[PDB]
């Protein structure tokens, strides 16, 4: 949100967080990369 | 953002799950859109404009021609089940929760999609503007300027 | 690194060192050969119950 | 029609042509219940006289299988570009680390760690405690006798 | 047959009605792979009947799960048979025992 | 491999000739969607 | 080479008709275990044997039914015929017939005996009949082979032949089915201590111990001759 | 076959244009009219093209140059 | 009770028995507990799944 | 068919160095590849005639806790370096060797006295580390004839490295001849200490086993 682009997110504020060793390149869909890792560990608890 | 990320990482850490906070910030950013305005600002005397469109409009109107006409906005967050429906393309955000109301609203307003969401390219069945097809999508956008 | 009780975290950090220091293919072939050793020695060890 | 009949008759030359063509044609595998990016990965196919695909023990953690009753989805990309996309991005050799936190998904465990932890041990002192050697001779005397 | 069991498998086998049991029989005359005749003794015989009972087995009969139910007889020839005892062995049954 | 009727034949020919070239065209299910939408009181069409 | 002192075959023992023990002369260190391993695995893997490939009978058509007068099904007929043990002379592909009537038990003894065929266990059970009027009439062919084969393998060899009524079974082609070895230090004197190995095995009587051991050694030498050059 | 594709990645860097370059090379290689600059080892066109881009003898630039070369040579 | 039964059939009470390799014939350390289990076959068969 | 067994014809061998070699075979019969590999490995490790150094008598204290006295290097690693020497003896029996050099420091295998049948594979081998001054030392080494490998704990002083081998290993792979794929492919990998070609070594092992097992057949395959 800090990055001011009005469209998507620039690579200059995200780092890598991937199995590579370089900054994220253009065209990579972070949103698809996101939103899926969060709920993947579906081993939470119910009924408190 | 800080409160949300702290609260969610507490829950993911009490169990043992280790996850970066950047995805959570992405969730917040997708969640934090659709600012509401109180001043007209010569933009529109209505409510429910996108934050990005408002920022682009104020950048193109203030610095260029008239900087005195300021449009004050209040950035109001919306829940996922509601913010997802807030899309400029009728095709997208349709199969998510409900279709008939979205179709009625699009036909009433007469909106056009431009096929900008990924689901649009999926349903039509072309290269999505991501990964390998990003360069092709960019070239198509570039050639669309001239004709 | 190879002189320890060599638990699961030991082998984990060993692969981490091999990846960050050497690279992709060295650590991939390293893990391959490690797992082959694991099958061989477990089958040789016995480890009855 | 000649090709169809001979393929249906399953001659040795047909097997030879299969082997020649499949030898350079990678193939993609998927878990039916999938949650993250690693539930789908590509591999080099190898012919084995059986009827159950041989999956490597390491990628079992990513595919989250357990060698109980399960069904895998297999897919073939046909265009040259799709083979290339599989080779460059969806191979296991490239996908060593997690896209979630950064920790390696490949976490060896079970028999491998048990055996390694076993052979890096010493009761008090086994046969031939005081021997000295260069390092390759250790296995030479371990396989046969002496220690 | 199972080496280590609990004993209730015998009751399950004799109660599922899958095998063939003998009712009011005293001794067997003829044995076939698909047909068994028992000669009831006069003790358990009432007047007005021939004094024999026939049991036709189940040979390779299609089951609901597309499996096979085949009954295999137990006695050989001229064996004294009491009441309430098994004669054939149905699917996964051995000597009147659930052997699966 | 989808409902593109004019694509499956052409990909088969490209394979047997060893061409390995693909032209997307348009899935037929999208036309199905358009036809069923036009079944109700809603216009829908694709511009140029 | 320093006086390797190759061992020799001595003291062949016969524990029983289907069980025997073999003794070998002492040999140098580090040899007994590997030679025992090789001989055991070769003897259990590749060694010619004679078994039943298919049985045809005029009475019944297929193997999933019964016959009038018999107690056990055609399945037990085929399985027990799988368990029969016989040896054959030089020529292979030998067909023998079995015809009998009555209510008495049927064994391997009451079969038409020809000069090239000899039974080792005449007390086998061929699923005795129960009816006086019942009479079985089947003819069997026995061939020789080396390794285990299923029924599906020999299907392509028969396309126009094999009419109805001819039933095929599986062959073992393995007449020993069990062998073990043990090495000890004995039979050595006036020299550095040597080791001797004893081989304990059980066959079905089709093949003699010395013959099988010699065949294993011969094929071992043949397969290792390629590594000479 | 190749186990890891990293040299081509280093020669390219963007990770997205390398697939396009190798695909456009392999298409012309398979349709014919060209020869492999790298000695083949009985392998398909895609592997030869990817080894060529890994060796540092072909990229998205000299393809345009050589293509304009035969286009003007006609 | 089980250990008492094992002695009658000439079996070790611990149940551990030395094993050799059928591939290299080297005696295994860590004496193994071998046994006889009642396995069952299920209709979940690969001949239907392919 | 009845008694016919396939024989390996693809015996291609590719080598990296004169002491390292890779041996690959064609698909062999079922279950025999690993038998043969284990047998050849055990023959190569258990008994292989060769010449090696048996023990040394250095000038000073026979105890292991000796002094540097200008050598500045403990005798233990000196003996270890001595074990890494491939001495070749042509026809003679156990013989005594000795060396003497000035105080330059590089102690090589050429420092030993040259005998009629005493040969060294590569004279550049290190025997002692660089010395500190012009002080010399007498080795008084000797070699013996033997086969296989025994330690010096039981049979005396450093070791007995009679096997002219460094490392031995093997693998078995599956392959197909025409249709059936249930075939065994044997791959042999072994590193040589020296003085013996790897293919020569494996040929010697095969001949050794053949002449260890020939009378088991009682003169079979006459014609």
| Contacts for G168 with CB less than 8 Å, ≥ 6 apart | G53, G54, G151, G154, G162
Distance from the Cα of F48 to chain H's closest Cα (Å) equals 27
CATH number of G1-48+174-229: 3.30.1360.10
Q: Which chains touch A (3 or more CB pairs under 8 A)?
A: B, D, H
Q: Is E50 helix (H, G, I), strand (E, B) or coil?
A: coil
Interchain touch H–E (≥3 Cβ pairs closer than 8 Å): no
Interchain touch G–J (≥3 Cβ pairs closer than 8 Å): yes
Overall domain count for chain H? 1
Residue E66: left (phi > 0), alpha (psi -120 to 50), or beta?
Answer: left
Answer yes or no: are the C-beta atoms of J194 and J21 closer than 8 Å. Answer: no
Phi, psi angle pair for E94, to nearest 5°: -135, 115
| Contacts for J172 with CB less than 8 Å, ≥ 6 apart | J33, J34, J37, J184, J185, J186, J187
Ranges of beta strands (E only) in chain D are: 27-31, 40-43, 72-75
Interchain touch J–I (≥3 Cβ pairs closer than 8 Å): yes
**Pairing status of strand E97-98 against strand G166-168:** unpaired
How far apart (Å, rounded) are the C-alpha atoms in residues J76 and J157? 11
Burial J142-156 (b: 16+ CB within 10 A, else e): ebbebbbbbbeeeee
Does residue D127 sit at the I interface (CB-CB below 8 Å)?
Answer: no
Tokens of B40: 């007209």
Q: Which residues does H contribute to its contact with F (CB < 8 Å)?
A: 27, 30-31
CATH number of J50-162: 2.170.120.12
**Neighboring chain G residues of I25 at a CB cutoff of 8 Å:** 33-34, 36-37, 40
User: Which residue, among D37, D101, D105, D107, would best test binding to B if mutated, counting the most B CBs under 10 Å from its CB?
Assistant: D101
Distance from the Cα of B49 to chain F's closest Cα (Å) equals 25
Does residue D27 sit at the H interface (CB-CB below 8 Å)?
Answer: no
All CATH 2.170.120.12 domain ranges in chain G, comma separated? 49-173
Output the DSSP codes for J62-124: SSSS---TT--S-HHHHHHHHHT--EEESS--SEEE-B---SS---BGGGBPP-SSEEES-TT
Q: Which residues pair with G97 in a beta bridge?
A: G139
Number of C-beta neighbours around residue J196 at 10 A: 19
Residue B79: left (phi > 0), alpha (psi -120 to 50), or beta?
Answer: beta
Output the DSSP codes for J64-81: SS---TT--S-HHHHHHH
Answer yes or no: are the C-beta atoms of E32 and G66 closer than 8 Å. Answer: yes
Q: Is D2 helix (H, G, I), strand (E, B) or coil?
A: helix
**Neighboring chain I residues of E65 at a CB cutoff of 8 Å:** 43
Answer yes or no: are the C-beta atoms of J123 and J158 closer than 8 Å. Answer: no
The answer to whether G34 contacts I22, with C-beta atoms less than 8 Å apart, is no
Answer yes or no: are the C-beta atoms of J146 and J47 closer than 8 Å. Answer: no
Q: Which residue precedes each gap in chain D (C to N above 2.5 Å)? A: none
Technique behind this structure? cryo-EM
The vertex-J208 CA angle with J204 and J214, nearest 5°, equals 140
**Neighboring chain D residues of A33 at a CB cutoff of 8 Å:** 37, 99
Answer yes or no: are the C-beta atoms of G32 and G188 closer than 8 Å. Answer: no
Does residue E73 sit at the G interface (CB-CB below 8 Å)?
Answer: yes
Q: Which residues pair with D25 in a beta bridge?
A: none
All CATH 2.170.120.12 domain ranges in chain J, comma separated? 50-162
Q: Specify burial of residue B129 (Cβ count, 10 A radius: 0-12, 13-18, 19+).
A: buried
The answer to whether D140 contacts J166, with C-beta atoms less than 8 Å apart, is yes
**Neighboring chain B residues of D103 at a CB cutoff of 8 Å:** 18
Output the DSSP codes for G126-165: ---B--SS-EEEEEEEEEEESS-B-TTGGGTT-SS---TT
| Contacts for J45 with CB less than 8 Å, ≥ 6 apart | D140, D143, D144, G30, J148, J149, J163, J165, J168
C-alpha distance from residue F19 to each of A8, B133, F7, H39 (Å): 38, 21, 14, 23
The answer to whether G130 contacts E77, with C-beta atoms less than 8 Å apart, is yes
Q: Measured in Å, how far apart are chain G's first and last C-alpha atoms? A: 20
User: Which residue, among I17, I19, I20, would best test binding to G if mutated, counting the most G CBs under 10 Å from its CB?
Assistant: I20
All CATH 3.30.1360.10 domain ranges in chain G, comma separated? 1-48+174-229
> How many Cα atoms occupy the beta-carbon half-sphere of A45 within 13 Å?
9
Q: Which residues does C contribute to its contact with H (CB < 8 Å)?
A: 23-25, 28
C-alpha distance from residue G218 to each of D63, G87, G223, H50, J3 (Å): 50, 21, 9, 52, 11
> How many Cα atoms occupy the beta-carbon half-sphere of D142 within 13 Å?
14
Alpha helices in B2-131, H assignment, sequence order: 2-15, 22-31, 51-62, 80-83, 100-109, 118-124
Query: Is residue D68 marked as binding?
Result: yes
**Neighboring chain H residues of A27 at a CB cutoff of 8 Å:** 16
Q: Is G19 helix (H, G, I), strand (E, B) or coil?
A: strand
Nearest to J203 among G6, G45, G227 (CB): G227
The answer to whether F27 contacts B103, with C-beta atoms less than 8 Å apart, is no
Number of C-beta neighbours around residue C32 at 10 A: 14
Distance from the Cα of H4 to chain C's closest Cα (Å) equals 6
**Neighboring chain B residues of D100 at a CB cutoff of 8 Å:** 19-20, 23
Tokens of F8: 């499956």
Distance from the Cα of D49 to chain J's closest Cα (Å) equals 7
How far apart (Å, rounded) are the C-alpha atoms in residues A11 and A17? 12
Tokens of B125: 């069945």
DSSP code of residue J139: -
**Neighboring chain J residues of I24 at a CB cutoff of 8 Å:** 34, 38
**Axis crossing angle, helix H17-31 with helix H45-55, rounded to the nearest 10:** 130
Q: What is the CA radius of gyration of chain E?
A: 15
Phi, psi angle pair for C2, to nearest 5°: -90, 0
CATH topology of domain G49-173: RNA Polymerase Alpha Subunit; Chain A, domain 2 (2.170.120)
Query: Is residue D122 marked as binding?
Result: no
**Neighboring chain D residues of F11 at a CB cutoff of 8 Å:** 78
Nearest to G218 among J30, J147, J217 (CB): J217
How far apart (Å, rounded) are the C-alpha atoms in residues D110 and D61? 12
Q: How far is CA D121 from the centre of its chain?
A: 29
Q: Which residues does I contribute to its contact with G (CB < 8 Å)?
A: 22, 24-25
B134: nearest CA partner in chain H:
H16
Range of the domain at H30: 1-74
Residue B118: left (phi > 0), alpha (psi -120 to 50), or beta?
Answer: alpha
G41: nearest CA partner in chain I:
I22
**Axis crossing angle, helix J32-46 with helix G32-45, rounded to the nearest 10:** 170
Q: Which chains touch E (3 or more CB pairs under 8 A)?
A: G, I
The answer to whether I31 contacts C46, with C-beta atoms less than 8 Å apart, is yes
How far apart (Å, rounded) are the C-alpha atoms in residues E70 and G72? 12
| Contacts for A32 with CB less than 8 Å, ≥ 6 apart | B118, B130
CATH number of J2-49+163-221: 3.30.1360.10
Mapping DSSP onto H, E and C, the string for chain I reads CHHHHHHHCCCCCCCEECCCCCCCCCCCCCCEECCCCCCCCCCCCHHHHC
Query: Is residue A13 marked as binding?
Result: yes
**Neighboring chain D residues of C4 at a CB cutoff of 8 Å:** 120
Q: Specify burial of residue J221 (Cβ count, 10 A radius: 0-12, 13-18, 19+).
A: exposed
Instruction: Tell me which residue has tokens 């060295």.
Output: C26
Phi, psi angle pair for J147, to nearest 5°: -135, 155
Phi, psi angle pair for G24, to nearest 5°: -120, 155
Expressed in Å, this structure's resolution amounts to 5.8
Instruction: Tell me which residue has tokens 């429910």.
Output: B48
The answer to whether G34 contacts I25, with C-beta atoms less than 8 Å apart, is yes
Answer yes or no: are the C-beta atoms of J135 and J70 closer than 8 Å. Answer: yes
| Contacts for G124 with CB less than 8 Å, ≥ 6 apart | G80, G83, G84, G85, G107, G108
Does residue F43 sit at the D interface (CB-CB below 8 Å)?
Answer: no
């Amino acid at each position: 949100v800090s990055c001011d682009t009005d469209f998507g997110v620039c690579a200059h504020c995200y780092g890598r967080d991937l199995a590579r060793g370089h900054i994220i390149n253009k065209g990579e869909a972070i949103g698809v990369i996101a939103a899926q890792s969060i709920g993947e560990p579906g081993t939470q608890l119910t009924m408190r | 953002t800080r409160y949300i990320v702290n609260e969610v990482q507490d829950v993911y850490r009490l169990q043992g799950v280790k996850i970066n906070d950047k995805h959570i910030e992405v969730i917040v950013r997708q969640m934090l859109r659709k600012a509401t305005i109180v001043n007209a600002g010569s933009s529109d005397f209505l409510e429910g404009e996108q934050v990005e469109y408002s920022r682009v409009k104020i950048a193109n109107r203030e610095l260029e021609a008239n900087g005195k006409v300021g449009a004050t906005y209040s950035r109001d967050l919306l829940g996922i089940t509601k913010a997802s429906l807030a899309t400029e393309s009728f095709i997208s955000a349709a199969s998510f929760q409900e279709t008939t109301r979205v179709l009625t609203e699009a036909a009433v307003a007469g909106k056009r999609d431009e096929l900008r969401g990924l689901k649009e390219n999926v349903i039509v069945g072309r290269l999505i503007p991501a990964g390998t097809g990003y360069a092709y999508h960019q070239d198509r956008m570039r050639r669309r300027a001239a004709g | 690194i190879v002189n320890q009780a060599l638990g699961k975290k030991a082998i984990s950090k060993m692969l981490n060192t091999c990846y960050r220091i050497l690279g992709l293919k060295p650590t991939v072939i390293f893990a391959d050969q490690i797992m082959y050793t694991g099958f061989a020695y477990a089958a040789r060890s016995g480890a009855s119950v | 029609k000649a090709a169809k009949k001979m393929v249906e008759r399953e001659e040795a030359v047909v097997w030879d042509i299969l082997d020649e063509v499949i030898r350079e044609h990678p193939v993609l595998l998927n878990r039916a219940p999938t949650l993250h990016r690693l539930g789908i990965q590509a591999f080099e196919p190898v012919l084995i006289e059986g009827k159950a695909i041989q999956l490597h023990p390491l990628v079992c953690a990513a595919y989250n299988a357990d060698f109980d009753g399960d069904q895998m989805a297999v897919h073939v990309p046909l265009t040259l570009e799709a083979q290339l996309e599989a080779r460059a991005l969806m191979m296991s050799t490239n996908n060593i680390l997690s896209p979630a936190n950064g920790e390696p998904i490949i976490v060896p465990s079970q028999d491998v760690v048990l055996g390694l932890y076993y052979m890096t041990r010493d009761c008090v002192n086994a046969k031939g405690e005081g021997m000295v050697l260069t390092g390759p001779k250790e296995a030479e005397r371990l396989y046969r006798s002496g220690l | 047959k199972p080496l280590v069991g609990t004993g209730m498998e015998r009751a399950v086998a004799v109660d599922s009605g899958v095998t063939a049991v003998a009712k009011r029989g005293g001794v067997v005359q003829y044995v076939d792979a698909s047909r068994i005749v028992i000669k009831v003794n006069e003790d358990e015989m009432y007047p007005g009947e021939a004094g024999i009972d026939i049991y036709n087995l189940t040979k390779y009969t299609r089951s609901n799960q597309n499996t096979c139910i085949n009954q295999m007889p137990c006695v050989s020839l001229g064996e004294p048979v009491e009441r309430g005892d098994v004669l054939a062995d149905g699917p996964s049954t051995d000597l009147g025992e659930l052997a699966l | 491999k989808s409902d593109d009727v004019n694509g499956r034949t052409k990909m088969y020919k490209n394979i047997v000739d060893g061409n390995h070239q693909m032209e997307p065209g348009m899935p037929e299910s999208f036309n199905v969607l358009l036809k069923e939408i036009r079944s109700l009181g809603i216009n829908i069409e694709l511009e140029d | 080479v320093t006086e390797f002192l190759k061992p020799r075959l001595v003291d062949i023992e016969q524990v029983s008709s289907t069980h025997a023990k073999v003794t070998l002369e002492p040999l140098e260190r580090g040899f007994g275990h590997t030679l025992g391993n090789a001989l055991r695995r070769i003897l259990l893997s590749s060694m010619p044997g004679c078994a039943v490939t298919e049985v045809e009978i005029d009475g019944v058509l297929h193997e999933y039914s019964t016959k009038e007068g018999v107690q056990e099904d055609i399945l037990e007929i085929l399985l027990n015929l799988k368990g029969l043990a016989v040896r054959v002379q030089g020529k292979d592909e030998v067909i023998l017939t079995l015809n009998k009537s009555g209510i008495g038990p049927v064994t391997a003894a009451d079969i038409t005996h020809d000069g090239d065929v000899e039974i080792v266990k005449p007390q086998h059970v061929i699923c005795h009949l129960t009816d006086e009027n019942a009479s079985i009439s089947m003819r069997i062919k026995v061939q020789r082979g080396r390794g285990y084969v299923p029924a599906s393998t020999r299907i392509h060899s028969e396309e126009d032949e094999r009419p109805i009524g001819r039933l095929l079974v599986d062959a073992c082609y393995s007449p020993v089915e069990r062998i073990a070895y043990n090495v000890e230090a004995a039979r050595v004197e006036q020299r550095t201590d040597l080791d001797k190995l004893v081989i304990e095995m059980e066959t079905n009587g089709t093949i003699d111990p010395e013959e099988a051991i010699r065949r294993a050694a011969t094929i071992l030498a043949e397969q290792l001759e390629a590594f000479v050059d | 076959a190749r186990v890891t594709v990293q040299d081509a990645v280093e020669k390219i860097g963007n990770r997205f244009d390398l697939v396009l370059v190798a695909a456009r090379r392999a298409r012309q290689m398979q349709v014919g009219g060209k020869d492999p600059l790298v000695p083949e080892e009985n392998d398909k066109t895609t592997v030869i093209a990817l080894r060529e881009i890994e060796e540092g003898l072909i990229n998205n630039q000299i393809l345009d140059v050589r293509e304009r070369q035969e286009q003007q040579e006609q | 009770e089980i250990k008492e039964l094992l002695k009658l059939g000439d079996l070790p009470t611990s149940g551990q028995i030395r094993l050799y390799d059928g591939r290299t014939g080297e005696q295994f350390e860590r004496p193994v507990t071998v046994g006889y289990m009642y396995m069952l076959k299920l209709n979940h068969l690969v001949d239907d799944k392919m």
